[PDB]
Amino acid sequence: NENTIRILISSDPHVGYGEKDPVRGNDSFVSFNEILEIARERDVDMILLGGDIFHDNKPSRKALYQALRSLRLNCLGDKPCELELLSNINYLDPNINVAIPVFSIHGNHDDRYSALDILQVTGLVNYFGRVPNIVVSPILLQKGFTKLALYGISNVRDERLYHSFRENKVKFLRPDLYRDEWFNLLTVHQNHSAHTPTSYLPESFIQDFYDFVLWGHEHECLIDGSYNPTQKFTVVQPGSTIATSLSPGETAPKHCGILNITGKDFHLEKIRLRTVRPFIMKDIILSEVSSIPPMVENKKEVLTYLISKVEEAITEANAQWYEAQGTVPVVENEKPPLPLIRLRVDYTGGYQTENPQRFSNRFVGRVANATDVVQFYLK
């Protein structure tokens, strides 16, 4: 639609993560490529990223090459950009045919010349929301009657930003012309909630004039979003495009989204990422497993139960992948990649265990993390 700004939203691709792993080495490149491919196939007006583009502060030559190759092949082309800039931006360059402009803030992993400066200098990404006293200035875009005021705050040490907000040292700049017509979009890369009272960014701290908050840094996919009643805005945490640890947060299926803006209204469409390796986690408390009698030489029974839980997790992972592809397990069809499987086992109350590497070895050629399938702990 001529009055609908269509933005592909994602965050935390971590290009280069696990590059050296023989099984997982290409995951970050394939999934960062997927995000750009979906944007092109779905004919969006622009891409908006929430930071942590590269895993390493100084990306490897392979990581940089792969990111540049994907951006060049998916973002350049004959497609006209229908976004009018009201207040340099790559699509306005007369020597580069930008079909889909990419906008990104920096995260803490992409810390004078960041890897993001390199993406910008090539004309492939618009690095915005720089934090050199913080002055948050918008990028003003128009498509028909729709007016977008895009704001960004690049990653700042959580305590430093929290103190800056407390000492009222954060300056949000608003356009005077077409005052209340602008759809206000904020992009951040901070902790959404931490044990420390100063290590995170509370939602209440964010100005209520904002309509939408794109929340980077947090890897868990919470793509459906959450409404803040006091501030009157809807926070969307798209999550990462790769699991950077085997944490419970990393298990939620990865998605990107299309944010459709018509006037001051929006429609968020969620898109399941097909290239993300399945990750299943099981949290087990042995004392809650009646089958296993406590305080006796129960290794055999502990092992039988845990082996059955890995098997169950593999079956769920394979099913999760076929679901993502819209396919069935048949000879003509591509087979799922090896899944990431993790059992967290609480062994309190008298239960014998097994060496984690010896346990993991029981699933060689069946799991992507053949070294750390199980973790035994005491509550």
């Binding site: 006209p80 950009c81 229908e82 976004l83 009018e84 800039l85 699509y91 306005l92 360059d93 007369p94 020597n95 580069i96 045919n97 930008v98 913080i134 200035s137 800056s164 907000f165 407390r166 009222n168 040292k169 954060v170 300056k171 949000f172 700049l173 608003r174 356009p175 005077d176 012309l177 005052r179 009272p197 509370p202 209440s204 701290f205 964010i206 100005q207 209520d208 004039f209 006091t230 501030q231």
Partner: peptide, 21 residues
């Protein structure tokens, strides 16, 4: 933290491509 709100300050200020071949 849940108490304070709207921290900092809020103040006011005053085809589309050029490629061809």
């Amino acid at each position: 933290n849940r108490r304070l709100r709207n921290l900092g300050s809020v103040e006011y200020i005053r085809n589309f491509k050029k490629f061809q071949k």
